[PDB]
Design a protein around this nucleic acid. Sequence first.
RNA 1: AUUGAAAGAGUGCUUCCCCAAACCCUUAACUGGUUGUAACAGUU
Length: 240
Amino acid sequence: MDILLVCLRFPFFSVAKRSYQVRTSFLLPPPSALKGALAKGLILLKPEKYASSSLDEAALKAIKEIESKLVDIKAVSVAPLSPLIRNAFLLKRLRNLESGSNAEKSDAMRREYTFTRELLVAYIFKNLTQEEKNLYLKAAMLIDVIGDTESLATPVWASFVKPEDKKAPLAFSAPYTEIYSLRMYIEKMRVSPEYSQEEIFYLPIEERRYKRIVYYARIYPPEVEKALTVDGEVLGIWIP
RNA sequence: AUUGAAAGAGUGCUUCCCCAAACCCUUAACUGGUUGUAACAGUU
């Protein structure tokens, strides 16, 4: 039982809801975005099994393999330790995807983003082989973008941390289906990527303010018997 | 390769041009370094 822990000092990401005329984003990267980034890294390493007729089904089978090697659908988690905040960006995005209306149709969409400093990302596996563990360790890097291509990501280091079975407060995401008894945040982040199911995620991140805004930080973590230590502090990852 | 793939709030704009801190305006005036005092006494 090992956990792939990756540190990335990415500046921004954009992952919106079912949104139009504006794209308000999640406070933390969704599991789907992390899985897509890992699939991109795996494809970049070697397309010995990810190369086929179409890119759509190739990405679909890459995500299927990732889910198969992960314990379950809601396995990969993300946890910040720096105060992250949500800001707004107005960019001229094309809206030609609508019914007709030529192809150069573009409007100034308020594509808002989320600024931060540093986050931890944990992947849960099922005792993968040494060759595959090395492949995923070298796939833990090459995360050169998160969410949209307008905001990129940059990993710092990757490691294989052990659960070590110590009781401590947690900071990583966990599904709300089984977490009821545990200052609390909760939304849906589409854990299953859509390539052409119903669950809600929980985040231990509050709102806070400085003058009239909200910069999201973490306070009063709940108690979970599963936690580990890294970089001198203590984090907590839920285990199904 | 990620509710993500494509993605200009962006494209031109003299805060500009005109406009004397400008004009009139004797530190000016009245007023002594002034007054007294042997380089002196004495010397082959």
